[PDB]
């Protein structure tokens, strides 16, 4: 199961709950109302913080940024953890940015349940 | 005895039920609310009926 | 209030009597009030 | 479906009462698809195992959740119908003290304004 | 030791309860206290509401120029962190203003907009369905 | 809990500041009877009184929902539209069940 | 009158018939303008507009005395923005009914100077300036200029 299917499935989750007519309170996001952390994955290896922030700031102020790069060479592994300032912005970002193409690579977004600092 | 027996016959009786439902079917009236509100053999869905009643 | 076939001459004509009959029932305590007088009653069959 | 299956298996090992007592309070949840997940398991479980271990407080919460879930169906689906059917025909003769609530609710929903609920 | 990591992880714990909703809760509790120390019924003479309605700046009026002047004069003198400034951001269901380093481009997937469309459409279909029910009646 | 009315400043102040034994007459269903039955209006009143008895403070808070909620001089209670009356009815029942949970050590999602 | 969706002269003419039958309605309507203006800030702009039109109609039918304009002490401070929109709608309306000429004659006849005082305020130059500029922005440039002629020659 390659990450593009993990994109397709989150999008399926959204549009399926749309077909079912779920109220905004029992959305599948409601299980995450205590965490303002999203995970971005699939990122290209040349994007830096400056880019991740200039892209993802569309939906709020970004409080924390954590781009996980391989310790030996320092180069990005290709995924990030991002702490918005209001949980609701994470709602917005997961719905809106999951599946956008940045430089051909189609990045993917999803919340984080019990983030552990590094 | 007769007070209580008659107050209960008016709520329960099957033939009175058949009547009320022939009336409803003839008017084609339908309720909108489910659950039949907190009416039960509690007294109040009776109490505000035409007989005046005071709470003190 | 209460949100093909091959049919005869009379069924594609003539009024529909059901809604007339239902209007009369609903207002029947007024339409059939006792004390407006001709002094003759009629008792229905059974 | 995969979650439904392994929950029924865990039921087979640890007995019904445990699983049931874990998920009865969800028959009163807001997401219908979720209520229907828990109804599908509860129904499959009690169909297999039978309700010998359902205690009093559990059969109480169970009949209550059953009724509520029945009274909220936005959809068209036989899930809650078979849930009711099997749960009731498994409780067997322990369901006497509830037939007045059941009968009263069914007569009252028979008089409602929309043909989905009357049907 | 425990003290240093306590500092670190308590900070991270608020940041995961991210600040904005926390300060909103703060103003909520103080609003509830202010209120609870007041009568049950609010009239139209209550000084708070009278004053608020005075300062309520509605359209058209040429006082607006002088008053926007007053407040844009004063609130210039603030230690605020920067706010976004540029071509209007798209609309989002919570009305959240972009961060101050958003580069303007709108990168969305087209979800907020189709949501808005879905809601307007349900309104239209409700009018149609009412009309048809009663038309038959 | 009809005595909970003694918290509503109108009745309370009237009684406190009376100099004479005297009979007064109020209407507790301000206008509701234009568009609900006496049945629904009694139910709504019972909720309001119960919640004003049980906590009285978060009850004031719920019954003044918006900053521009107001009450008119001959009225006991705020002027809300039937939508907001439905909402605040729900919130008062939640208040009452919460305080029953607190002071009887029950999970209320179980009843 | 005020709660309706849009104006029609019915309510104005009806009150007019009552005040034209006896005085008490004339009294109560001068009081009415007083208090309505003072507490207008509470009206959403449609009802505010309808009140403004109502008073314009009464004034040009001369059921109210033109004195009642005493109330608009048209400083900048002494007036909320809502009061300002009320004066805007009111004066637009009066001008569109009696025309700028008859409106000008009315506002320029002498005996109504005391009541038109704060409306044409020359004592304090600051509100004199602001008044003039407001009146211009809405488009009563004629009364505007006459007063500026006065003020420019005053210093």
UniProtKB/Swiss-Prot annotation, chain A:
RRM domain residues: 36-114
Subunit structure, as described in the record: Part of the activated spliceosome B/catalytic step 1 spliceosome, one of the forms of the spliceosome which has a well-formed active site but still cannot catalyze the branching reaction and is composed of at least 52 proteins, the U2, U5 and U6 snRNAs and the pre-mRNA. Component of the minor spliceosome, which splices U12-type introns.
Function: Involved in pre-mRNA splicing as component of the activated spliceosome. As a component of the minor spliceosome, involved in the splicing of U12-type introns in pre-mRNAs.
Stated name of the protein: RNA-binding motif protein, X-linked 2
Subcellular location: Nucleus
Family indicated by similarity: Belongs to the IST3 family.
Full-protein interval shown: 1 to 118 of 322
Top-level taxon: Eukaryota
UniProtKB/Swiss-Prot annotation, chain B:
Assembly description: Part of the U5 snRNP complex. Component of the U4/U6-U5 tri-snRNP complex composed of the U4, U6 and U5 snRNAs and at least PRPF3, PRPF4, PRPF6, PRPF8, PRPF31, SNRNP200, TXNL4A, SNRNP40, DDX23, CD2BP2, PPIH, SNU13, EFTUD2, SART1 and USP39. Component of the U5.U4atac/U6atac snRNP complexes in U12-dependent spliceosomes. Within the minor spliceosome, which acts on U12-type introns, interacts with PPIL2 and RBM48. Core component of U2-type precatalytic, catalytic and postcatalytic spliceosomal complexes. Found in a mRNA splicing-dependent exon junction complex (EJC) with SRRM1.
Domain notes: The MPN (JAB/Mov34) domain mediates interaction with TSSC4 and SNRNP200. Has structural similarity with deubiquitinating enzymes, but lacks the residues that would bind the catalytic metal ion.
Domain of life: Eukaryota
Tissue and organ distribution: Widely expressed.
Portion of the full sequence shown: 1725 to 1780 of 2335
Organism from which the protein derives: Homo sapiens (Human)
Compartments, as annotated in UniProt: Nucleus; Nucleus speckle
Protein name: Pre-mRNA-processing-splicing factor 8
Swiss-Prot record, chain D:
Entry comment on modification after translation: Phosphorylated. Phosphorylation occurs concomitantly with the splicing catalytic steps. Citrullinated by PADI4.
Location of the protein in the cell: Nucleus; Nucleus speckle
HEAT repeat extents: 13-51
Record family assignment: Belongs to the SF3B1 family.
Complex and partners: Component of the 17S U2 SnRNP complex, a ribonucleoprotein complex that contains small nuclear RNA (snRNA) U2 and a number of specific proteins. Part of the SF3B subcomplex of the 17S U2 SnRNP complex. SF3B associates with the splicing subcomplex SF3A and a 12S RNA unit to form the U2 small nuclear ribonucleoproteins complex (U2 snRNP). Within the SF3B complex, interacts directly (via HEAT domain) with SF3B3, SF3B5, SF3B6 and (via HEAT domain) with PHF5A. The SF3B subcomplex interacts with U2AF2. Identified in the spliceosome C complex.
Reported function: Component of the 17S U2 SnRNP complex of the spliceosome, a large ribonucleoprotein complex that removes introns from transcribed pre-mRNAs. The 17S U2 SnRNP complex (1) directly participates in early spliceosome assembly and (2) mediates recognition of the intron branch site during pre-mRNA splicing by promoting the selection of the pre-mRNA branch-site adenosine, the nucleophile for the first step of splicing.
The protein's name in its UniProt record: Splicing factor 3B subunit 1
Organism annotation: Homo sapiens
Residues of the whole record sequence present: 831 to 949 of 1304
Curated annotation (Swiss-Prot), chain E:
Residues modified as Phosphoserine: 85
Cell compartments where the protein resides: Nucleus
Modified residues (Phosphotyrosine): 12
Region (Disordered): 56-96
Functional note: Involved in pre-mRNA splicing as component of the activated spliceosome. As a component of the minor spliceosome, involved in the splicing of U12-type introns in pre-mRNAs.
Subunit structure comment from the entry: Part of the activated spliceosome B/catalytic step 1 spliceosome, one of the forms of the spliceosome which has a well-formed active site but still cannot catalyze the branching reaction and is composed of at least 52 proteins, the U2, U5 and U6 snRNAs and the pre-mRNA. Component of the minor spliceosome, which splices U12-type introns.
Family label: Belongs to the CWC26 family.
Name of the protein in its database record: BUD13 homolog
Full-protein positions shown: 483 to 619 of 619
């Amino acid at each position: 199961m390659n990450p593009l299917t993990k994109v397709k499935l989150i999008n399926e989750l959204n549009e399926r709950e749309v077909q079912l007519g779920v109220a905004d309170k029992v959305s599948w996001h409601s299980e995450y109302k205590d965490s303002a952390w999203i995970f971005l994955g699939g990122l290209p290896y040349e994007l830096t913080e400056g880019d991740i922030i200039c892209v993802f700031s569309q939906y709020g102020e970004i409080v924390n940024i954590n781009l996980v790069r391989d310790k030996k060479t320092g180069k990005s592994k290709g995924f990030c953890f991002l702490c918005y300032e209001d949980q609701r912005s994470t709602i917005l970002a997961v719905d809106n940015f999951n599946g956008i193409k940045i430089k051909g690579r189609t990045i993917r977004v999803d919340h984080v349940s019990n983030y552990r600092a590094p | 005895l007769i007070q209580q027996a008659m107050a209960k016959i008016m709520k329960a009786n099957p033939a009175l039920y058949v009547l009320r439902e022939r009336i409803r079917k003839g008017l084609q009236l339908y309720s909108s609310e489910p659950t039949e509100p907190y009416l039960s053999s509690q007294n109040y869905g009776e109490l505000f009926s035409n007989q005046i009643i005071w709470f003190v | 209030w209460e949100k093909w076939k091959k049919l005869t001459n009379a069924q594609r004509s003539g009024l529909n009597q059901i809604p007339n009959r239902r209007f009369t029932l609903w207002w029947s305590p007024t339409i059939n009030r006792a004390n407006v007088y001709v002094g003759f009653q009629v008792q229905l069959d059974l | 479906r995969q979650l439904v299956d392994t929950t029924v298996e865990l039921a087979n090992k640890v007995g019904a009462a445990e699983i049931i007592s874990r998920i009865v309070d969800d028959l009163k949840d807001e997401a219908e698809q979720y209520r229907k997940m828990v109804m599908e398991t509860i129904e499959k479980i009690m169909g297999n195992l039978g309700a010998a271990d359902i205690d009093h407080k559990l059969e109480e919460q169970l009949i209550d959740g059953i009724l509520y879930a029945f009274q909220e169906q936005t959809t068209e689906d036989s899930v809650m119908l078979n849930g009711f059917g099997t749960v009731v025909n498994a409780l067997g003769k322990r369901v006497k003290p509830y037939l007045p609530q059941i009968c009263g609710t069914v007569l009252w929903r028979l008089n409602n304004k929309s043909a989905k609920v009357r049907q | 030791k425990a003290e240093k990591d306590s500092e670190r992880d308590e900070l991270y714990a608020q940041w995961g309860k991210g600040l904005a909703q926390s300060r909103q809760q703060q103003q909520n509790v103080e609003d509830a206290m202010k209120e609870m120390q007041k009568p049950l019924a609010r009239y139209i003479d209550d000084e708070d509401l009278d004053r608020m309605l005075r300062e309520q700046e509605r359209e058209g009026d040429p006082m607006a120029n002088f008053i926007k002047k007053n407040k844009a004069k004063e609130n210039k003198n603030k230690k605020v962190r920067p706010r976004y400034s540029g071509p209007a951001p798209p609309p989002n269901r919570f009305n959240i203003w972009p961060g101050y380093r958003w580069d303007g481009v709108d990168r969305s997937n087209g979800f907020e907009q189709k949501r808005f469309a879905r809601l307007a459409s349900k309104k239209a279909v409700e009018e149609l369905a009412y009309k048809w029910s009663v038309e038959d009646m | 809990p009809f005595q909970a009315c003694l918290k509503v400043e109108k009745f309370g102040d009237l009684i406190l500041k009376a100099t004479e034994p005297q009979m007064v007459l109020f209407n507790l269903y301000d206008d509701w009877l234009k568009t609900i039955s006496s049945y629904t209006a009694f139910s709504r009143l019972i909720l309001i009184l119960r919640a004003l008895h049980v906590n009285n403070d978060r009850a004031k808070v719920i019954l003044k929902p918006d900053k521009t909620t107001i009450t008119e001089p001959h009225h006991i209670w705020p002027t809300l539209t039937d939508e907001e009356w439905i909402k605040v009815e729900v919130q008062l029942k939640d208040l009452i069940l919460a305080d029953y949970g607190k002071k009887n050590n029950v999970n209320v999602a179980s009843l | 009158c005020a709660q309706q969706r849009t104006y029609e002269k019915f309510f104005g003419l009806l009150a007019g018939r009552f005040c034209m039958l006896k005085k008490e309605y004339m009294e109560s309507f001068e009081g009415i303008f007083k208090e309505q203006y003072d507490t207008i800030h509470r009206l959403e702009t449609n009802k505010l507009r309808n009140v403004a039109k109502m008073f314009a109609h009464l004034l040009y039918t001369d059921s109210l005395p033109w004195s009642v304009l005493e109330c608009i002490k048209l400083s900048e401070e002494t007036t909320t923005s809502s009061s300002r929109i009320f004066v805007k709608i009111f004066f637009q309306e009066l001008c569109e009914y009696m025309g700028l000429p008859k409106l000008n004659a009315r506002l320029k006849d002498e005996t109504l100077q005391p009541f038109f005082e704060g409306l044409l305020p020359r004592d304090n130059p600051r509100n004199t300036r602001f008044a003039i500029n407001f009146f211009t922005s809405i488009g009563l440039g004629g009364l505007t200029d006459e007063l500026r002629e006065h003020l420019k020659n005053t210093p």
